[PDB]
Design a protein around this ligand. Structure first.
Ligand SMILES: CO[C@H]1O[C@H](CO[C@H]2O[C@H](CO)[C@@H](O)[C@H](O)[C@@H]2O)[C@@H](O)[C@H](O)[C@@H]1O
Ligand SMILES: CO[C@H]1O[C@H](CO[C@H]2O[C@H](CO)[C@@H](O)[C@H](O)[C@@H]2O)[C@@H](O)[C@H](O)[C@@H]1O
Ligand SMILES: [Ca+2]
Ligand SMILES: [Ca+2]
Ligand SMILES: [Mn+2]
Ligand SMILES: [Mn+2]
Lengths: 241, 241
């Protein structure tokens, strides 16, 4: 299809079009990307991801069209600690994508250790909400919590300082305009605190014509829950001139 | 998801989200539901169907909601014969639906001979465009080409007279309003000729909560091409009170 859109105001346990990978599962009408114990407390060493089953037609070579898309979602992070880790990310990748071996912790379940910073070895665009930046294990991160745009590497091409608020929902809007090639991210807390980061990228040179979209999250030594509360997505192939 | 929509202004051969059953296949940017030879001519004894891969959430028992949906599409039928057969239908059925054994010809690839008219043995709602009504074989049909609403039986709960026009595209809009439980069908030819038919049905007593939507067509002794040219669909769960 040239256009596709779906919306999950909440996430009832009875799902049919979501691909669950790793420890991701439904709990309390929300998607818990990372594992939690019987009491709902976050645990260490856990990775989880979800992808919508239907493939998205991001661009079409024959017609020279590229899709304009928008993804709106909200999530919250909670942890008994204060150095919750590692983060959640919205991502776009080939349809057959699976959790790379050894991609836990700071690799957010998106990259393999050996090629995490090798742009020519990956095919993925992601918007990460990174809460752990210890320079001994996350050498690629700026020294502070941040939102970043990742293009084929765990080392963001662009970032903005962000504030982690335990238990508060962050509302996010990610937009890609094929006319300007601008991938825009706007995140806001209920009180109006706003964060913005943008970057110009030609999706055609990074991803194949058909892709899948979803979310990934991980916790290594440090942990926190990565709760996806709602999500809507829409994409429309448009002629770019 | 509570809401889902997709649009196929045309059908390029590079498809990822359609389930092809029987002889259905893409040719010349359109879906040929029934088999055609090398020259693109229709042949006898053929059945074919397509279904969008993502499941649609039709109704939800726990929340007492029912989907409001709309399906817009266009097709054309063509045949060198005086009596092209057998017809095409838009349908809704359980997610694991497949072509029943012996459902060719007048059964449109939707029902098995043994239970074609047994409403308690089927789970399907279809809008048929029936061009073959020979009273000796299709005994259940009115004696003329017609548009029919089928609820668990090849014997339409309602039909209206319709004219078959060789090679002309018919545009159809099928709507279901959960508030009134009215399933409306509006079909038009390019010259303005219009056909309307409506029926009240509680979808909750006929179909499971999750379903797949698609098209089906068949040709028995007589034949014709059944070409699906475009299709857009949208559905949204709504509180019914
Ligand atoms: C906690 O520091 C010790 O372990 C470090 C390994 O860090 C893991 O946990 C991080 C946060 O969950 C995660 O970002 C990283 O990928 C690892 O999974 C190590 O680097 C320190 O030197 C120290 O031993
Ligand atoms: C060709 O006529 C002979 O067979 C007929 C069987 O009818 C088949 O074809 C019809 C039109 O394609 C279709 O509606 C039906 O389901 C069968 O597939 C029969 O009716 C005639 O009396 C004759 O024997
Ligand atoms: Ca990090
Ligand atoms: Ca018939
Ligand atoms: Mn980072
Ligand atoms: Mn009929």
């Amino acid at each position: 299809q040239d256009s596709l859109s779906f919306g999950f105001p909440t996430f009832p346990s009875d799902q049919k079009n979501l691909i669950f990978q790793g420890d991701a599962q439904i709990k309390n009408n929300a998607v818990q990307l990372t594992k939690t114990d019987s009491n709902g407390n976050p645990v260490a060493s856990t990775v989880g991801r979800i992808l919508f089953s239907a493939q998205v037609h991001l661009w079409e070579k024959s017609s020279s069209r590229v899709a304009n898309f928008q993804s709106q979602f909200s999530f919250s992070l909670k942890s008994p600690l204060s150095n919750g880790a590692d983060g959640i990310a919205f991502f776009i990748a080939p349809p057959d994508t699976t959790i790379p071996s050894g991609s836990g912790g700071g690799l957010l379940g998106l990259f393999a250790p050996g090629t995490a910073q090798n742009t020519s070895a990956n095919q993925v665009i992601a918007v990460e909400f990174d809460t752990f930046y210890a320079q001994d294990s996350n050498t690629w991160d700026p020294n502070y919590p941040h939102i970043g745009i990742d293009v084929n590497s765990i080392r963001s091409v662009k970032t903005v300082k962000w504030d982690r608020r335990d238990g508060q929902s962050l509302n996010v809007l990610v937009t890609f305009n094929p006319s300007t090639r601008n991938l825009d991210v706007v995140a806001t807390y209920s009180d109006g605190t706003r964060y913005e980061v943008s970057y110009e990228v030609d999706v055609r040179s990074v991803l194949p014509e058909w892709v899948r979209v979803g979310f990934s999250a991980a916790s290594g030594e440090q942990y926190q829950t990565h709760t996806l509360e709602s999500w809507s997505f829409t994409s429309t192939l448009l002629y770019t001139a």
